[PDB]
Amino acid sequence: MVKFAGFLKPLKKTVLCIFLASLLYTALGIAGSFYIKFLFDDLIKFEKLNDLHIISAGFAVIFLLQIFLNYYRSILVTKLGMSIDKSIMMEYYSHVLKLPMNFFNSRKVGEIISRFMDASKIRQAISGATLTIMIDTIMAVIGGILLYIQNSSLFFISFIIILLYGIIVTVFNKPIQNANRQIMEDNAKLTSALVESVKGIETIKSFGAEEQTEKSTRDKIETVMKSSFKEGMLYINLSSLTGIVAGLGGIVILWAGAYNVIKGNMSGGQLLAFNALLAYFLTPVKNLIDLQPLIQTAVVASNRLGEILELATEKELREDSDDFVISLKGDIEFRNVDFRYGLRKPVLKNINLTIPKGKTVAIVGESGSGKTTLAKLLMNFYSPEKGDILINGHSIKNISLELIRKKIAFVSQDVFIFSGTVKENLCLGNENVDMDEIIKAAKMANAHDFIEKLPLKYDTFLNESGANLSEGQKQRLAIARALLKKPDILILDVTVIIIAHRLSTIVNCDKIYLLKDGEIVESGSHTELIALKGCYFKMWKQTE
């Protein structure tokens, strides 16, 4: 669609104030643009002093009023630009935070962060000068319709100059757009490269691969600068084609004005005043054209920021919801669930689980069987394509995600810790939870002993992805967080689905499922599985 900023609807009064101030400003400018005519035709050509001082003082007062009214519209336009830029950035950030998981696994962090950071633009194209120049271009249309009365042929020449400007801008419409798009794409790729290199640097500084990374970054920077030089060449071509027209048109204006003066009609002071009126007719237009890089860059930034990440399907746009579900204690009843990650290969075949309520079910299989795939399916990070997962007799499709992702706690290997207070880390999601509950969950997660050892026991900072604490001391914070988010289906009288790789820790479990070709081949407790001479028996005898 079209990303037209409708945020100005609550800003109706400000726009009217700006427009009226600009109208009076241009009116005073044109009124004060007769000073040189007053000088040459009447003040000195008649040899009359003691009134030139009065005229000069009056025009100084007029210019002071012009500055006073240009100190106001600039402030108002800056406020409008702030109020638009903040709103558009917040829209984009909320939408990206509510996007599905396929988007986040099929894209690089650099692309998203660069698409956001391309918001200094748009703002720079709606700043004070950039938009007051467009308003003054309209005011220059008004000044030109005034200019038509003040001599005719010179207004025709000015119109021809405007036509030349229009042709020049039209011919250079696409190239600046494409150059900006390509430089933005290359800058996004470079930003992703730096984000990856600085994020994981233990591997680089561990394998002695600084030189290779530097060479790859040099290639990316070389591409960025080549695509920047292309834009520079197009910009210099545009600036030259505009400067030629402007200067030669001004010289033609002076030549034709002299030609008129030495041929009866019109006067020299009329020509001198016509130069300043022609300034208020052309200089806004030429200033706008010289701003075409800024407007074009902002248009490209708003197009990329809105093409995707403002049109892509959201998370909540999945299905309907329900009101009868208030608790999530039930029997999970996978029916022929098939999940394919993208398009590579079906991770899960026609799987079938019969997890009872409040059990301690364990899941085993090959290293690439898809256990974490099952855990992600149960958390609605993804969706099946032919089957129907259920809980308590009703499908989890028809349950509000704010309930599924609140009553199911899932702890994984990729423990992620946020920058902030340990209490703030623990109380993510439900911030209002009191000290007693976080203490209880920490004690139940064995993390309370560690936390009380640190100085500023719970009120201590954790830097970025946990560095103030060891990796084994962050799995326990993940456990404590999952315990705070009081669950009904716990994935590692609440149902516990433990996914583990060692066959010795999960033995005394109510039921154990084993999946090899996606589907479950064997099930039951440990004793019956051992008394089967099956795949689980082979695994147990090999790992004994």
Place this chain on the structure above:
Amino acid sequence: MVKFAGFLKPLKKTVLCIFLASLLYTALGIAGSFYIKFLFDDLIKFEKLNDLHIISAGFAVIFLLQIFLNYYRSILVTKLGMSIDKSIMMEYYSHVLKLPMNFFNSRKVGEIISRFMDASKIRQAISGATLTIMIDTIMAVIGGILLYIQNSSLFFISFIIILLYGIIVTVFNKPIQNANRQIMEDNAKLTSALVESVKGIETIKSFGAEEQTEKSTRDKIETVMKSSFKEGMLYINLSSLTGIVAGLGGIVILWAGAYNVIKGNMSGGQLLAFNALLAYFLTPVKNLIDLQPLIQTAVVASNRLGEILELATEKELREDSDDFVISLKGDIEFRNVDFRYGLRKPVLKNINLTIPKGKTVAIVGESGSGKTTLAKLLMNFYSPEKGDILINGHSIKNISLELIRKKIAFVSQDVFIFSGTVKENLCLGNENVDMDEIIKAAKMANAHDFIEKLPLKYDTFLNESGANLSEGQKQRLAIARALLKKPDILILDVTVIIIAHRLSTIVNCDKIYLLKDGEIVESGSHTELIALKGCYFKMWKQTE
């Protein structure tokens, strides 16, 4: 301090060509600034046609030559700016990749990316189109001495205008700098928060947090735009003062010139041509003052990059390398080694670890004893304290870090994968290694099977953080990579140091070290360590 003469000393012919072209350009501009003097006082006041056409054509030719010179000077200036930017940017990037690990563990990924973007700002701001205007200030000095030659009465007023410009810039240099610094700091903080949120959006979705993070990002954006508004107010005050001075000075010039014409030195040329010449004395200065915010922004960004650049690398510290060490087949001899991450608390104290050659020793302890700290100290990621690490009988402090990183392989549980080809992921540091060693290291690491089952075998593409592979499948890639980097002191007849949190895998280790309270309390083989009624005994009986 941050001088670009290092990247500018090679570029001298370009600078000479730019300066000479600019000199001819301003000379032709001053020559063309006599058109109106020729027009009124000689071509109009004498009523002579034809010669008017000839002079108009001549001045059109002069202006065309001016444009032809400005084209080349702009091309050369943009080439110079591009080269300077690339050079400084790569200096910063190489320095940051060579920085120690304390810096990377005490900073955020957002800050580095923001400073790199500020280097890009240095590119766009100052050295892209504005060096053609800084020269014009000196060329305006030339035009001003010519103005004094032309008429000494109005040169005093022009000098007073220049003095007012200077006072305004002097009194507005500081607040613009401070506002730019504050907006850059706040934008860096916003970038850090955003990269943390988008990078680690697993916990935000799982628990449900795309309201708290949204509120925090809204607060950060509000602070960013508050600083932006402060900068905007300072810029508007600057622009208003400059506009008042310029406009009122121009009107005073016109008034005083009319007074001179009626009361002394006269004719229209000495005013109409004087203003055209003044366009080559005051207009470049006003353009420079208008560009001053951009120059100050570039200066602040260069200051931040220089603040990063002065930080010592890893090679600058830990000097006195050695050349007589070729292999790392020796006895690790931790002697009274102490360590302390920053200033929190010593995680190690007087450790007397004495690993022999070629064994398969294991290190065990509590959940925060410091096993991975020992691995980092031996791999030489962090700086030890009183005492030193010995390998092959000599200290580790005097060994080429390249040899250490290429001869000690560390396999940590925070496995990191790079967004590239699988073969490129495997060969990190030594790209020339043939596929035979790749296959051998994969088969020895059991990672060959799943790689072979990938859709595009050993040269498949991987997303960031190995999102295209399972958590178990990613660690086997780390094992295969560390095996490719043929080690001698491999940490998980080469010495093997196994860090494990269990007690059943290490029953076959040659020796077992028990890191409990900073030091090593007990050591030996499994059987003798069980026959010690010590801390390992209670650990074994509790885990049984």
